[PDB]
Design a protein around this ligand. Structure first.
Ligand SMILES: OCC1O[C@@H](O)[C@H](O)[C@@H](O)[C@@H]1O[C@@H]1O[C@H](CO)[C@@H](O[C@@H]2O[C@H](CO)[C@H](O[C@@H]3O[C@H](CO)[C@@H](O)[C@H](O)[C@H]3O)[C@H](O)[C@H]2O)[C@H](O)[C@H]1O
Ligand SMILES: [Ca+2]
Ligand code: NA
Ligand code: NA
Length: 487
């Protein structure tokens, strides 16, 4: 049914979202929210409409979601990064780039103001950067040529010049890690598998949109891709995905996330071991492994991908990937424990306040809707709405705190051709009905009205379900934001 959750099931926190896909995740922690930026995985089909394996043909945008609590995620839509080959309908930002794989994100205070930098790979040929004054844009290409190419000093022996990771150190110096691939083309020797020497680190200029000096090689044993950097107790941890070829020793298992430490961001690094098995080990099958380690609201986590949504829909992952987050633990000696990747994920860290404007596209669970960029007046940058709403569809938030006094009323911004209803229920999709909002015909799908209705019996902490009903097909209404009022 639908009606039913695809993969992220009520009470579980992984995958983070399941109303569309998101590969190669990276995290930015910024002023009480974590933002996750992702390659734009999107199904490819044979001409007869049957699913086929991901060939990365759709990897020309960056999807962005954010959360204050690890359970409810705001969908910020897509950044149209790639602008070459007519990509993104002429509205792509980096006109030189045909692709925008594997984003990295950084924030640095420049001239007294926080500036944001989004890095990406134009497939395996070069890394670019876009800039913005907020974590969600709007975005500018201040170069627009690649930032790093094989002609950048120190980058010549890189096989795949991709998968950037950008770190801003405590002294404000930025560093870019990148590269991967295995030399030897169709058939690497054992020694080429064991020491590809294709990983690189280069210092960035103060502006974060230039490099200084030359790149240094990081000799990551069995390097493949997926550079990562985090800093824990004054030590720099370079992490990466271990390759799949050649014989491997016990301590460098194929397709797992390995890590190295150094007292300096540019090395020398020493291999320490491995902390994330292949997603296939946990969720069945196998595929590429991509990750980022981050500290959010004082806890260490890893964001990574797995084929958990595509598998649920098609009965095979086919290379189509979804974001997951689990806790990461450093030991007293500075080594990292194996991450227990799972569906349960991270328990909600803070309650949601239902008395502020909350985007309709801020939800923890759904069955089964879509989000798209919204014609509603006002709203946040790249404001989205919930759409593809049919009778019996629903969305839900985790742990909204109505307080002891509870809610007086409920408001929703909606656009509808024929009208419908939003039932507000506590705890479950068939739970206590605290109100029902009648969505009128507004004049059309792009004509917006804020509607208010009474609620009663909404006190304390509950999951909240918004259950959609109406007659006729197809889309009952679009749904932009909501807000409760306090008793
Ligand atoms: O090989 C065994 C194996 O074990 C199985 O149980 C698992 O299911 C598999 O995951 C695993 O196979 C490996 O799977 C990973 C995940 O996709 C592959 O890595 C990708 O390699 C290809 C290259 O063929 C990709 O696409 C290439 O990217 C370059 C970047 O420059 C680009 O030029 C071009 O479009 C492609 O050639 C990705 O880059 C990798 O993630 C292993 O190849 C595969 O053996
Ligand atoms: Ca909205
Ligand atoms: Na990455
Ligand atoms: Na639907």
């Amino acid at each position: 049914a639908t009606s039913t959750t695809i993969a992220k099931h009520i009470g579980n926190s992984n995958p983070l979202i399941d109303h569309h896909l998101g590969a190669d995740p990276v995290a930015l922690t910024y002023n009480g929210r974590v933002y996750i930026y992702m390659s734009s995985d999107d199904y490819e089909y044979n001409s007869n409409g049957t699913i086929k394996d991901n060939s990365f043909a759709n990897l020309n945008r960056v999807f962005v979601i954010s959360s204050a609590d690890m359970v409810n995620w705001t969908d910020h839509g897509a950044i149209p990064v790639a602008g070459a080959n007519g990509a993104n309908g002429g509205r792509g930002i980096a006109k030189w780039a045909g692709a925008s794989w594997a984003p990295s994100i950084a924030v640095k205070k420049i001239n007294g103001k926080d500036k944001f930098f989004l890095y990406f790979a134009n497939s395996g040929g070069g890394i670019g950067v876009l800039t913005a004054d907020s974590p969600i844009g709007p975005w500018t290409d201040p170069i627009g040529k690649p930032l790093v190419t094989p002609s950048t000093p120190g980058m010549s022996g890189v096989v795949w010049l991709f998968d950037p990771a950008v770190f801003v150190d405590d002294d404000g110096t930025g560093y870019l890690y990148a590269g991967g691939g295995v030399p030897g083309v169709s058939n690497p020797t054992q020694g080429q598998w064991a020491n590809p020497k294709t990983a690189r680190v280069i210092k960035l200029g103060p502006d974060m949109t230039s490099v200084v000096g030359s790149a240094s090689t990081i000799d990551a044993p069995f390097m493949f891709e997926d550079s990562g950097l985090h800093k824990y107790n004054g030590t720099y941890y370079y992490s990466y995905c271990i390759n799949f070829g050649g014989t491997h020793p016990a301590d460098k298992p194929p397709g797992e996330i390995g890590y190295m430490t150094s007292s300096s961001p540019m090395g020398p690094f020493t291999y320490r071991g491995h902390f994330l098995k292949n997603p296939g080990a946990f969720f069945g099958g196998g595929g590429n492994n991509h990750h980022a380690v981050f500290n959010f609201k004082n806890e260490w986590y890893v964001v990574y991908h797995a084929q958990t949504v595509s598998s649920a829909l098609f009965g095979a992952g086919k290379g189509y990937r979804s974001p997951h987050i689990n806790k990461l633990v450093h030991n007293a000696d500075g080594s990292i424990q194996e991450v227990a990747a799972n569906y349960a994920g991270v328990t909600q860290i803070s309650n949601l306040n239902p008395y502020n404007r909350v985007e309709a596209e801020t939800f923890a669970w759904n069955g089964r809707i879509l989000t798209e960029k919204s014609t509603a007046p006002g709203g946040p940058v790249n404001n989205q709405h919930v759409t593809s709403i049919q009778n019996g569809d629903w969305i839900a938030v985790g742990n909204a705190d109505f307080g002891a006094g509870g809610a007086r009323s409920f408001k929703a911004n909606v656009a509808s051709t024929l009208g419908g209803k939003i039932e507000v229920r506590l705890d479950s999709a068939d739970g206590k009905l605290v109100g029902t909002l009648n969505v009128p015909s507004t004049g059309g799908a792009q004509t917006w009205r804020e509607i208010e209705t009474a609620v009663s019996g909404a006190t304390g902490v509950h999951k909240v379900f918004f259950v959609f009903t109406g007659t006729g097909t197809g889309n009952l209404f679009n749904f932009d934001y909501w807000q409760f009022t306090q008793r």
